Each structure stands twice: as C-alpha cells, then as structure tokens.
Amino acid sequence: IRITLTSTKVKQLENVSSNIVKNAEQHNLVRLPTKVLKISTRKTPNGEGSKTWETYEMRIHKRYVQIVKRITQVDVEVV
Amino acid sequence: MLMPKEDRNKIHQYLFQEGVVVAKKDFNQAKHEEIDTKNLYVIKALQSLTSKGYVKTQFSWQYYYYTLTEEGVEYLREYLNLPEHIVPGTYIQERN
Amino acid sequence: KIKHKHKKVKLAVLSYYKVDAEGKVTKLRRECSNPTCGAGVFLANHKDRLYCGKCHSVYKVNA
Amino acid sequence: ALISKKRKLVADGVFYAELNEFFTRELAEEGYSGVEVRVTPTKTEVIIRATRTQDVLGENGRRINELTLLVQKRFKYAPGTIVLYAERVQDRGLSAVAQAESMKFKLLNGLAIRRAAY
Amino acid sequence: ENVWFSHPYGKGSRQCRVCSSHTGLIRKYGLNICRQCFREKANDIGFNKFR
RNA sequence: UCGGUUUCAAGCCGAUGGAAGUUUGAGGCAAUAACAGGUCUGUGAUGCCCUUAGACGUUCUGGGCCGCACGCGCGCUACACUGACGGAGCCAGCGAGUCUAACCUUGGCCGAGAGGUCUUGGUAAUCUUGUGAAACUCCGUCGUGCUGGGGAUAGAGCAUUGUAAUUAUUGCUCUUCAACGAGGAAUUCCUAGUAAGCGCAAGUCAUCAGCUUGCGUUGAUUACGUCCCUGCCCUUUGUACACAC
RNA sequence: ACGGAAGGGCACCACCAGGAGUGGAGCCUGCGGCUUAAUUUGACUCAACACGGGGAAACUCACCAGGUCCAGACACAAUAAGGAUUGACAGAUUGAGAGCUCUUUCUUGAUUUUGUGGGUGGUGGUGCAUGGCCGUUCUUAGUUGGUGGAGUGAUUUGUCUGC
Ligand SMILES: [Mg+2]
Ligand SMILES: [Mg+2]
Ligand SMILES: [Mg+2]
Ligand SMILES: [Mg+2]
Ligand SMILES: [Mg+2]
Ligand SMILES: [Mg+2]
Ligand SMILES: [Mg+2]
Ligand SMILES: [Mg+2]
Ligand SMILES: [Mg+2]
Ligand SMILES: [Mg+2]
Ligand SMILES: [Mg+2]
Ligand SMILES: [Mg+2]
Ligand SMILES: [Mg+2]
Ligand SMILES: [Mg+2]
Ligand SMILES: [Mg+2]
Ligand SMILES: [Mg+2]
Ligand SMILES: [Mg+2]
Ligand SMILES: [Zn+2]
Ligand SMILES: [Zn+2]
C-alpha cells in the first residue's frame, strides 16, 4: 500500500494520519512542505488614495487486501 | 421571436421531461451544451416562457437557471399535445 | 435619408400549375437534384438559371 | 481532471463560492445559513444549513429533486453523484448571515427601521 | 448574418465569472474573478489574510 | 539573574548569561465620531433622469486613446580608471507550470545571433531547477581627452508573436554615435542584514517591462538626540470663530 | 475649533548627524496644455499625476468615420391560410464573399410582422440621491454608557496633580 493525502486545514488532515498509523497495527502488523498560494492585489475597488496592497494566502499541507478496501471509508487519494 | 414552430417546441419535451435548464449567458454561443439549438434560442424561448408564467428563473454568476411551475403542467397541453397528467417531470423517474 | 423595409412581393400565392382539360396535373418549371427538394419544392426561375426555393445554399440544378 | 492540487483547491472553493452565492441568491427568502461540501468518496454531499427547512421537498419530493438535477446540469455532474443533504442550522440566532436576510425581508414589508432593527 | 460575431483570445475572450467584466481579471490558478469580485468572495474560496 | 537606580512603587539604566533582551525583528487585526473624500468605468448592486430601431442597445470594418512650439509628477539609463570590455571563476531565495489540452521545457543536432528542430521529463519537495541570476571574484586589454565613457537618433538586413506589426510589438546583425564633463533655488526617502548597489520570480501576458507585489545576493556611512522647521497628542488659557483662522 | 498663548509629551510621511538621491542631460511612463474626425474618461496637497491594478495594435472601448442585427420578453387591437412572416444563387452593390436597399419570383409556415402599450439593455448622467468597498482625518491613543457627585441649563465628573 501507499497513500498520499492533502487538505488545507491541518486537524482533520492529521486525524487520518494518526487514524492510519493505528490501522497500521490493525492485526499487530507493519510531511511535505506546506504550499502557500499568494494572491496580492489592491484594497481599493477603484483607484483612489494611498496605494495599498494586500496579500491573501491558501495553505496546502500534504503528507504520506480485504482490510485495504475498508480503510478509505479532507482530500482522500491512494495508489 | 423568429423561430418557427419546429423550434419553440424543438424542446416542448426537455422542459416537461427533464424539468430544468442551464444556459451560461452567451448570445451567439449558437450551440447549447445539452440541447440542439442556438443557446440564444433556449434563453429567448425561456424568456417568452417565464414572462407568461409557467416557469421561473434565477441568475447566480452568469448561468441563467430555469425552473417550471405547476402552471406549466397544464400549459403543456394546448400545443404540447400530451395525455393529461399521464406523466410529469419530478414524478417517479429514478427515485420518486 | 432613413433606411427602408422589405417588399417581399407576395403575389396571389403560388402563381403557376396548369389544368389541362378539367383536368390533370400538367406541371410547369423544374425540380432540383435532391430529396431536400423532395417534390415539396419545384425550382425558381429568376434569370440565367432555375435556382431552388428551399435549397437556396447549394444545388443550382439546370436542364 | 488532470489538475495540480493547487488549481483544483482554488477551483474547489470557487465551486463552493458560486454554490453559496447561488444558494443565497436563490433561497434567502426561505432562510439559509451556509453550505457544507463534504469531499467524500463516491457522492459529493452538499449539506445545506437552513433555518426553515421544508422549503426543499415541495410536492413531498418536488423541490430538492428540482435542485439536485439543477446543480449537476450547470456543473456537468452525471446524475446521482450530487447528494443534496438538507440539514437545519445550528441555533439560527447564531448566524448573522441568516438574520440579515431575516431583516431584509422584514423591512421589505414596510416595518419601521428602528422597529425591525431593534 | 454570419458577419455578426465574426471576430475573436486576449482581453475580449476573458471575463470575471461573476460580472462579465473584462477588466482587472485575476487568473492566477485560473479562478478568473475581478480583483474587486475576488476580494468579496475570497473569504470562502479558501484565501484568508494572515500577514 | 546580579548590580546601579529609584522617590514606597510602576519602571528605567548597566552586565553576565542566551539562538534570541528596540513590545526580540517584521507584519495581520484594529475603536467612537466624521469627509458631501474617491468609486454608478467591477458587479446580473442600485433611486431618479436620459436613450430604446436612423438606438447611447449590440455587432462588424477601419482610425484614436501613443498625435507635438511647451510646463510638471513617478522612473530607466549615464557622465566613467572603486571604470568599460574580453576571457575566467562561480554563489541564492520567493515562486509559477498541460486533457473537452498544446503550460513550464532539459538533452540531442542546425544557426554568428535572434531563433529553428526531432525527441524528453513534470499536474510538479520528483521534472524544467543547484533555476550555474546579476552585482560580485581571479587574469588581461585600454589611458584622460567626450575616449574603447555614453547609447539617444537614424539607415540596411535577418528572425519571433499574431487574422492583421504601417504610426518601427518585441528579439538579433552591422552601421550612425546626440545631450550628458556630476545637476540652481528647491525637494523625497531612510536608523540594521537597514540605506544604497545587484539581479530573480509572480501579477500583467498572444507578443511587449523602463511599472508594481515579493524574494534573496553584496552590504556601509550616521544618529540611539532635540522641539528649530513641518507636525500629532494632553492639560491650562483667550476668542467678536460655529460654513469653526 | 482656532491662537505669530503657556505647561508637559511624541514622530526620519519632522528636523538634527549623514547616507542614497530627485530637481539639470537622454529616453521610459503618467498629468496638464496645444493639436484633432476623435485624440473616450475618472482623479488635482498631503490623501490626483508607472494611480483606476490603466503595460490600449484587433478585442479591450467608453471616443471618431461608416455598415448589420434585435438578442423589441408577455397582453391587446391588426395582419392571416383565395399568403402573416421569414429567406436567398448572381449582378447592380459595397471595405467586404452582405440579398442592409433595389432588379429578380422563388422560398418559408403562425413561429412575427404593422401598431398602441409595455419591456429590456445601456463603460449614457447624477459619488451632491444610495448600498458595498476604499482612502483620509489618525499610526496616533483615543471613545462611550450605568449609577451616584456638581450645575436652572447646554454640560460636566468618571476620562486626574506628579511620576
Ligand atoms: Mg481608525
Ligand atoms: Mg465631491
Ligand atoms: Mg448606470
Ligand atoms: Mg492612456
Ligand atoms: Mg507617484
Ligand atoms: Mg560602451
Ligand atoms: Mg567583468
Ligand atoms: Mg518632507
Ligand atoms: Mg501598471
Ligand atoms: Mg530628469
Ligand atoms: Mg498623513
Ligand atoms: Mg480599438
Ligand atoms: Mg471597433
Ligand atoms: Mg457601449
Ligand atoms: Mg462621497
Ligand atoms: Mg448623573
Ligand atoms: Mg469627559
Ligand atoms: Zn434544391
Ligand atoms: Zn467581478
């Protein structure tokens, strides 16, 4: 098996990572850099005044037989 | 509008059969995705439709959504000759 | 200096089909070379050809 | 598909945005707090937090059915992958987004502003 | 006629998916929203402000 | 923490320690009352007015927004010898990137160049990418005067974007080689990895950065003060101001 | 609130000490003006003038010279089956391969044409009719109410000498 999982929030992103290192011992058996997407535009809707700039941000954190099909039941993906 | 009776009821079926439409606001799209006509024709027909009743509309980001009323379900008999209440759209089709 | 409408001269409907001896269909004019002129349109006669009435795009048929 | 997670997470929220100020632009007059999009296997469940909730089933099924097939028609979802769960809002006096619409309609029937604001 | 929409990409093809607006389009990651329209809807699209 | 300090205090100053001792450095957030500030040219936000077929709707063709006696604001490039040029050494970080598809492009050839071409990897901590960036660094050439400083103006030719380059889109080649010999009165910004020098990615974007939003590379001088000017705050004071010096 | 009034306090959008400059030159770019068929336009101190993310060949496009179209919903009266409407080869045409308008006589089938209303769109106007947002006052420490205290009252105390 090999799974790669991703989301924006971190809690329910790591409520599966732990929830899979505990199905790792399901019969006593066997972090990526965060991507910050920057949108940087002007506060003003028209053109007036002090020329004021404003960065926004998205935070993208990524990580990585009968028991296989009953483990996948946050952005879920595995190969 | 300039569209002979093989056009305004080019869909007198997708309306009563399916029930709703989608058409991104593009005059001169001229090829509706999901329907065989100009995308102009459906909207202008739906205009003509809604402005008499039988059907409502809503807009939400340039996608011209349409929905029809119980007043529709007895106007699809005068020239939409179908058996009276023999069927409808939101009746038993897949899960009703 | 304003623009102008279209005359589209109507005529007293289809002007030509001929009864013989009261009667039988004697016909007059020409047909096209398509089943889109499938005996529902027999061709115009304007000048220099017999172009269609329905096939106003392709099919300039002549005899 | 074939989109780097960047460009679809963007298009995830775009989908959420258009969904939302579609929903608000649609059924504000019936009371509507936000929308929850469950990114879940198979279906994409859209739970809708709503104040007054029976505005979703018309002739006993005739309204959410009219909506489910509407969102897929615009978003090209093949039928049955869009589940419109229609919940009820947690403590509707929790939502500014609800009460603002509770007043827009309230003043829109001539009730004095000091009256219907206080 | 067929000389109706008989011309083209560039600005004339793109528009904010909220207002049809050709001007000031934000298309990084292909969202295609006005700067103005973006800043309103940016709250729930996923972009928060931190610094 | 230890001392010095306070005026009992709140604190301030020095030191040792420490990755860290200017709220540790820099930001996001940010009240009440206001302005007839700006935006109906972002909204399918909108009151009223005007227009609605010879249209102020819309589309199409073509021109303009660039137009040049002149004044001004932001900047780019330079007057050089702490330099220009030629080899040579060779070091970042923030980023973006393709399937109802042609994005980022390595490697192979062709071309002096711009660029051309057959493969190629990457939906991206993988591939482009160690982004072998630029200033900078070692070695040489030039020799003080408009010079090999400077590259404006213009000619001729070859390419690239694009239905379309003319009023040069931009890139390349050769040629032409202007003012400018350190800028009057004025005036902007700035206290630490900051000023300034240097480039790079991202927005724009078919093509076009002398712009902006950021990121690192080289890395100082000078203050750790005052109320002189400009000016904010808090009292007290005077007023014939209240559309408020 | 204002003072070329006093007492404190505090800022490199203040000075001091200095750096780097800008102001001069050439070109980039924005504003004015002149020019023009039009040179679309908004903004004029800070807080207009590489600012409207405004780096415009077409588009953008709001300006200028011309040419199409209706995408004029729905109601009524009209037309209407002995033709409502719509359309077109070629030429005359025109930038044009455009049937806009004419020649021509064929289509086409109640679909829309004529008209009255009544819509609709509108980068048309009014930022001195608005919303939302933004800039600024103001980067500074400031603002309010309950209760009591003062005053006939507007008001005040709270929200303070000093550190
Ligand atoms: Mg404030
Ligand atoms: Mg004003
Ligand atoms: Mg308007
Ligand atoms: Mg201009
Ligand atoms: Mg400026
Ligand atoms: Mg030189
Ligand atoms: Mg060198
Ligand atoms: Mg100053
Ligand atoms: Mg710019
Ligand atoms: Mg100068
Ligand atoms: Mg100021
Ligand atoms: Mg133009
Ligand atoms: Mg034009
Ligand atoms: Mg217009
Ligand atoms: Mg105003
Ligand atoms: Mg009291
Ligand atoms: Mg007080
Ligand atoms: Zn024919
Ligand atoms: Zn928008």
CSV table of N, CA and C (backbone and C1' of nucleotides) in Angstrom, one decimal, chain F residues 98-122:
chain,number,residue,atom,x,y,z
F,98,U,P,-1.2,24.3,-15.5
F,98,U,O5',-1.6,23.2,-16.7
F,98,U,C5',-1.9,23.7,-18.0
F,98,U,C4',-2.1,22.6,-18.9
F,98,U,C3',-2.7,21.3,-18.3
F,98,U,O3',-4.0,21.3,-17.9
F,98,U,C1',-1.0,20.8,-19.9
F,99,C,P,-5.3,21.4,-18.8
F,99,C,O5',-5.6,19.9,-19.3
F,99,C,C5',-6.7,19.2,-18.8
F,99,C,C4',-7.5,18.5,-19.9
F,99,C,C3',-8.2,17.2,-19.5
F,99,C,O3',-9.4,17.1,-20.3
F,99,C,C1',-6.6,16.6,-21.1
F,100,U,P,-10.8,16.8,-19.6
F,100,U,O5',-11.9,17.3,-20.6
F,100,U,C5',-12.2,18.7,-20.8
F,100,U,C4',-11.8,19.2,-22.1
F,100,U,C3',-12.3,20.6,-22.5
F,100,U,O3',-11.4,21.3,-23.3
F,100,U,C1',-13.3,19.0,-24.0
F,101,A,P,-10.2,20.6,-24.2
F,101,A,O5',-9.0,20.2,-23.2
F,101,A,C5',-8.3,21.1,-22.4
F,101,A,C4',-6.9,21.3,-22.8
F,101,A,C3',-6.5,22.0,-24.1
F,101,A,O3',-5.5,23.0,-23.9
F,101,A,C1',-5.3,20.1,-23.9
F,102,A,P,-5.1,24.1,-25.0
F,102,A,O5',-3.5,23.9,-25.2
F,102,A,C5',-2.7,23.6,-24.1
F,102,A,C4',-1.3,23.3,-24.6
F,102,A,C3',-0.7,24.3,-25.6
F,102,A,O3',0.7,24.5,-25.3
F,102,A,C1',-0.7,22.2,-26.6
F,103,C,P,1.3,26.0,-25.0
F,103,C,O5',0.8,26.3,-23.5
F,103,C,C5',1.2,27.4,-22.8
F,103,C,C4',1.4,27.2,-21.3
F,103,C,C3',2.9,26.9,-20.9
F,103,C,O3',3.6,28.1,-20.7
F,103,C,C1',1.5,25.2,-20.0
F,104,C,P,5.0,28.3,-21.4
F,104,C,O5',6.0,27.9,-20.2
F,104,C,C5',5.8,28.2,-18.9
F,104,C,C4',6.6,27.3,-18.0
F,104,C,C3',8.0,27.0,-18.5
F,104,C,O3',8.9,28.0,-18.2
F,104,C,C1',7.0,25.0,-17.8
F,105,U,P,10.1,28.3,-19.3
F,105,U,O5',10.9,27.0,-19.3
F,105,U,C5',11.4,26.4,-20.5
F,105,U,C4',11.8,25.0,-20.4
F,105,U,C3',12.7,24.4,-21.4
F,105,U,O3',14.1,24.6,-21.2
F,105,U,C1',10.8,22.9,-21.0
F,106,U,P,15.2,24.3,-22.3
F,106,U,O5',15.9,23.0,-21.7
F,106,U,C5',16.5,23.1,-20.4
F,106,U,C4',16.9,21.8,-19.9
F,106,U,C3',17.8,20.9,-20.7
F,106,U,O3',19.2,21.3,-20.5
F,106,U,C1',16.0,19.6,-20.0
F,107,G,P,20.2,21.3,-21.7
F,107,G,O5',20.2,19.8,-22.3
F,107,G,C5',20.7,18.8,-21.5
F,107,G,C4',20.7,17.5,-22.3
F,107,G,C3',21.2,17.6,-23.7
F,107,G,O3',22.6,17.5,-23.8
F,107,G,C1',19.1,16.5,-23.7
F,108,G,P,23.3,17.8,-25.2
F,108,G,O5',22.9,16.6,-26.2
F,108,G,C5',23.5,16.5,-27.5
F,108,G,C4',22.7,15.7,-28.4
F,108,G,C3',22.5,16.4,-29.8
F,108,G,O3',23.6,16.3,-30.6
F,108,G,C1',20.5,15.6,-29.0
F,109,C,P,24.8,17.4,-30.4
F,109,C,O5',25.5,17.5,-31.8
F,109,C,C5',25.0,18.5,-32.7
F,109,C,C4',24.0,18.0,-33.6
F,109,C,C3',23.5,19.1,-34.7
F,109,C,O3',24.4,19.1,-35.8
F,109,C,C1',21.6,18.1,-33.6
F,110,C,P,25.5,20.2,-35.9
F,110,C,O5',24.7,21.3,-36.8
F,110,C,C5',23.9,20.9,-37.8
F,110,C,C4',22.9,22.0,-38.2
F,110,C,C3',23.5,23.4,-38.1
F,110,C,O3',24.4,23.7,-39.1
F,110,C,C1',21.2,23.3,-37.4
F,111,G,P,25.7,24.6,-38.7
F,111,G,O5',25.1,26.1,-38.4
F,111,G,C5',24.3,26.7,-39.4
F,111,G,C4',23.6,28.0,-38.8
F,111,G,C3',24.4,28.9,-38.0
F,111,G,O3',25.2,29.8,-38.8
F,111,G,C1',22.3,28.6,-36.9
F,112,A,P,26.8,30.0,-38.4
F,112,A,O5',26.6,30.6,-36.9
F,112,A,C5',27.7,30.6,-36.0
F,112,A,C4',27.8,31.9,-35.2
F,112,A,C3',26.5,32.3,-34.4
F,112,A,O3',26.4,31.6,-33.2
F,112,A,C1',27.3,34.1,-35.7
F,113,G,P,25.0,31.1,-32.7
F,113,G,O5',24.2,32.5,-32.5
F,113,G,C5',24.5,33.4,-31.5
F,113,G,C4',23.7,34.6,-31.6
F,113,G,C3',22.2,34.5,-31.4
F,113,G,O3',21.9,34.5,-30.0
F,113,G,C1',22.6,35.7,-33.4
F,114,A,P,20.7,33.6,-29.4
F,114,A,O5',19.4,34.3,-29.9
F,114,A,C5',19.1,35.6,-29.5
F,114,A,C4',18.0,36.2,-30.4
F,114,A,C3',16.8,35.3,-30.7
F,114,A,O3',15.8,35.4,-29.6
F,114,A,C1',17.6,36.1,-32.7
F,115,G,P,15.2,34.1,-28.9
F,115,G,O5',14.8,33.2,-30.1
F,115,G,C5',13.8,33.5,-31.1
F,115,G,C4',14.1,32.8,-32.4
F,115,G,C3',13.7,31.4,-32.6
F,115,G,O3',12.4,31.1,-32.9
F,115,G,C1',15.9,31.7,-33.3
F,116,G,P,11.7,29.7,-32.7
F,116,G,O5',12.4,28.8,-33.8
F,116,G,C5',12.2,29.0,-35.2
F,116,G,C4',12.9,28.0,-36.1
F,116,G,C3',12.6,26.6,-35.8
F,116,G,O3',11.4,26.2,-36.5
F,116,G,C1',14.9,26.8,-35.9
F,117,U,P,10.4,25.2,-35.8
F,117,U,O5',11.2,23.8,-35.7
F,117,U,C5',11.5,23.0,-36.8
F,117,U,C4',12.5,21.9,-36.5
F,117,U,C3',12.0,20.7,-35.7
F,117,U,O3',11.3,19.8,-36.5
F,117,U,C1',14.1,21.4,-34.9
F,118,C,P,10.0,19.1,-36.0
F,118,C,O5',10.6,17.8,-35.3
F,118,C,C5',10.8,16.6,-36.0
F,118,C,C4',11.8,15.7,-35.3
F,118,C,C3',11.2,15.0,-34.0
F,118,C,O3',10.3,13.9,-34.3
F,118,C,C1',13.4,15.8,-33.6
F,119,U,P,9.4,13.3,-33.2
F,119,U,O5',9.9,13.9,-31.8
F,119,U,C5',9.7,13.3,-30.6
F,119,U,C4',10.9,12.7,-30.0
F,119,U,C3',10.9,12.5,-28.5
F,119,U,O3',10.3,11.3,-28.2
F,119,U,C1',12.9,13.6,-29.1
F,120,U,P,9.2,11.3,-27.0
F,120,U,O5',10.0,11.9,-25.7
F,120,U,C5',11.1,11.3,-25.2
F,120,U,C4',11.8,12.0,-24.1
F,120,U,C3',10.9,12.4,-22.9
F,120,U,O3',10.6,11.3,-22.0
F,120,U,C1',12.2,14.2,-23.5
F,121,G,P,9.1,11.1,-21.5
F,121,G,O5',9.2,11.6,-20.0
F,121,G,C5',10.3,11.3,-19.2
F,121,G,C4',10.5,12.4,-18.2
F,121,G,C3',9.3,12.9,-17.5
F,121,G,O3',8.8,12.1,-16.4
F,121,G,C1',10.7,14.7,-18.2
F,122,G,P,7.2,12.1,-16.2
F,122,G,O5',7.0,13.5,-15.5
F,122,G,C5',7.5,13.8,-14.2
F,122,G,C4',7.1,15.2,-13.8
F,122,G,C3',5.6,15.4,-13.8
F,122,G,O3',4.9,15.0,-12.6
F,122,G,C1',6.8,17.1,-15.0
